[model samples]
Target: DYAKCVFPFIYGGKKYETCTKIGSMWMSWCSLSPNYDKDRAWKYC
Candidate 1:
C-alpha cells in the first residue's frame, strides 16, 4: 500500500509539494512526514 504524500515537505534541503523524482531518478516518491530528514519516511509512487 502507498503511504499518503505529505505536502510542503523538505527533501535534500529543498521544498516539495507533491510526489517527486529529485534524487531517485524516475521513481517518484513522497515524504510520509513533514520532513524527510526528521522521520526518514518515504515510499515510491
Candidate 2:
C-alpha cells in the first residue's frame, strides 16, 4: 500500500525545487542536468 499512497516532497513548506516527488519520497532531477544550479534551485526556499 505504500506505493499507492499519495506523497509530496516538501521543503520549507514548498514543493520540490529542481527535483521530483513520488508519494512521500523525493528525487533530484536537476542535479544530473547540465543546467543544474543549486543556488537558483533553493533561492526562495
Candidate 3:
C-alpha cells in the first residue's frame, strides 16, 4: 500500500509538481497523477 500528494513547490530554484514519497520512491507521474484524486500507487522498486 502507498500514499501520495501533489503540490507545486520550489526546489533548487525550480518549480515542479511534486508527488509524495514514503521512503526513497517518488510517486509515478503516470499512474499516481491519474489516481492522485483518490490514492497513491506504488509500483516502482
Per-prediction RMSD in angstroms? Answer: 3.1, 12.7, 9.3
TM-score computed on alpha carbons, candidate 1: 0.66
lDDT of each: 0.73, 0.32, 0.35
lDDT of 3: 0.35
lDDT of 1 by residue, 1-45 (tens): 235886787775577878888767767888777767756667776
lDDT per residue, candidate 3, 1-45, as tens digits?
123433343322233454334345554332223333333432232
Q: Which candidate achieves the best lDDT against the true structure?
A: 1
- lDDT of the structure predicted as candidate 2: 0.32
**Superposed Cα deviation of residue 32, candidate 3 (Å):** 16
**Residue 22, candidate 2: C-alpha displacement in angstroms:** 20
lDDT of 2 by residue, 1-45 (tens): 122222333343444434444343444332222232342322211
Model 1 residue 28 lDDT?
A: 88
Ranking under TM-score, best-scoring first?
1, 3, 2
Provide TM-scores for the models: 0.66, 0.19, 0.25
